[PDB]
Amino acid sequence: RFTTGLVYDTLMLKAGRIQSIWSRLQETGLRGKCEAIRGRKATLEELQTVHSEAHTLLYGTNPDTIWNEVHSAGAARLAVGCVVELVFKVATGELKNGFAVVRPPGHHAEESTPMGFCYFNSVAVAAKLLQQRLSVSKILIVDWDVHHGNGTQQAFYSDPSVLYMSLHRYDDGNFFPGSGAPDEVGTGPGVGFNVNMAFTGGLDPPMGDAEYLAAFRTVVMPIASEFAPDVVLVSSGFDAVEGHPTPLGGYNLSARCFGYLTKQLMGLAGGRIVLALEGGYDLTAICDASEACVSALLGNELDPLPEKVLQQRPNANAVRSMEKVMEIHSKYWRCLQRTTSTAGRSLIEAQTCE
Ligand SMILES: O=C(NO)c1ccc(C(=O)N2CCn3c(-c4ccccc4)cnc3C2)s1
Ligand SMILES: [K+]
Ligand SMILES: [K+]
Ligand SMILES: [Zn+2]
């Protein structure tokens, strides 16, 4: 069946996050309509596309204490394999789109550094193989986890074939992990092809749906469409959703909204989209968003957004964060060179003017 795939495996387990998510997906019936595929460990060679051999050898090998982390490393290896496996099946046609219910997160682990609960950058190794083994010419990586995807930025900071974009809380380098200034735009041949949609201004107020929805309207989608990729890999973290406190979270997106965001990202690349779980720790929130994202992947009719949110103009701290990022990347993209700024308008308004 040519439909929305999933990837699960209970050998990734220490109810937990991915277990709850998977449960929701069953009970809601979305799991039925999807094609659950088989996973595998990532190969040492596969992991070395992104990481160093020294790092691979240390953490890749099978040899409330020290052995906790060892299993989490063993899980992370399997995570990369699942994410590799789904991505290839969607990319080659076998499936329409996907969603990897995998843990731990990955987008933090750097070349030879395990940080932020992350051992191996799943979404990255996936992208690396797409290039090498399927000669894919353009890969879009949207990373909507609340945090900056420092691993993923580094992986492709010189390759203009992989457009990396990241919506995150930045606060002028006063948040985890600290990287991800909008000023960072790539390097060498890959200048212009790294876009940090970096929110500055703290929680006054907290960034919400309208703020992110604006950000898509004005930055993400314009650049992505122009760029026009063959495969979309989303580092789909749900720590932006409501119910993650100030420090290990901060913002208040509805889960509902992430469906809309999936729905929009499906516009690109023939719908060749795959989402992969990163952050998001509140069990209701991540179950909600997972429900919404997969529903949208199956092309189910979506629950309309509250009139309120559709009518709400984005907060100043956002509008200011958008204009700075837009300004910078107006140097490298035509859809930012033509126009005057409209990042202060609500959705309904922006559409009232098409
Ligand atoms: O969501 C994530 N990855 O997907 C995160 C990775 C790392 C995160 C982070 O901000 N950390 C800083 C806070 N922290 C702690 C804390 C330790 C004491 C008090 C508050 C936090 C332990 N580990 C971390 C990692 S969030
Ligand atoms: K890049
Ligand atoms: K991000
Ligand atoms: Zn996170």
Please provide the DSSP assignment of 173-206 as one string. Answer: T-SSS----TT----GGGTTSEEEEEE-STTSS-
Give the whole-angstrom CA distance, residue 251 versus residue 202.
Answer: 10
The 10 Å CB-count burial string (b at 16+, else e) for 266-278 is bebbeebbbbbbb
Q: Which candidate in 108, 148, 168, 329 is catalytic? A: 108
Q: CB neighbours (10 Å) of residue 52?
A: 14
Q: Output the DSSP codes for 25-75.
A: HHHHSHHHHSEEEP--PPPHHHHTTTS-HHHHHHHHS----THHHHHHHHH
69 alpha carbon, distance to own chain's centre: 24
Residue to mutate, 69, 120, 248, 278, ligand 1, most ligand atoms under 8 Å from C-beta = 248
For ligand 4, a single-atom ion, which residues have Cβ within 5 Å? Answer: 145, 147, 237, 239, 279
Question: Contact, 351 vs 243, CB < 8 A?
Answer: no
Separation CA 72–CA 116 (nearest Å): 13
Which domains are present in the chain? 1-354 (3.40.800.20)
CA distance 148 to 204: 20
Report helix, strand and coil shares of the chain as percent, to nearest 5. Answer: 45, 15, 40
| Amino acid occupying residue 118 | C
Is the beta carbon of 147 within 6 A of some atom in ligand 1?
Answer: yes
**CB of residue 209 inside a 6 A radius of ligand 1:** no
d(C-alpha 90, C-alpha 100), whole Å: 12
E-state strands within the chain: 5-7, 35-37, 98-100, 139-143, 162-169, 194-199, 231-236, 273-277
Angstrom distance (rounded) from CA 155 to CA 85? 20
Q: How many whole angstroms separate alpha carbon 123 and alpha carbon 102?
A: 11
Q: Identity (one letter) of the amino acid at 53?
A: E
Q: To which H or E segment does residue 104 belong? A: none
Six-digit token string for 331: 């140097």
Amino acid at residue number 44: L
User: What's the rounded Cα separation, in Å, for the pair 291 and 284?
Assistant: 10
**CA–CA separation, 333 and 201 (whole Å):** 26
State the amino acid at position 290 in one-letter form. Answer: S
Return the residue whose CA atom lies nearest to atom 8 of ligand 1.
Answer: 116
Which residue CA neighbors atom 25 of ligand 1 most closely? 116
Q: 117: Cβ below 6 Å to ligand 1?
A: yes
Crossing angle (nearest 10°) for helices 255-265 and 283-297: 30
For the CA of 238, the nearest ligand? 4
The CA distance from 296 to 266, in Å, is 9
| 55 classed as catalytic | no
The answer to whether 240 and 206 are in contact (CB under 8 A) is no
Q: First-to-last CA distance in the chain?
A: 38
Distance CA 53, CA 294 (A): 35
Residue 105 near ligand 1, beta carbon < 6 Å? yes
Method: X-ray
Which residues lie closer than 8 Å to 272 by C-beta, 6 or more apart?
90, 91, 97, 230, 231, 232
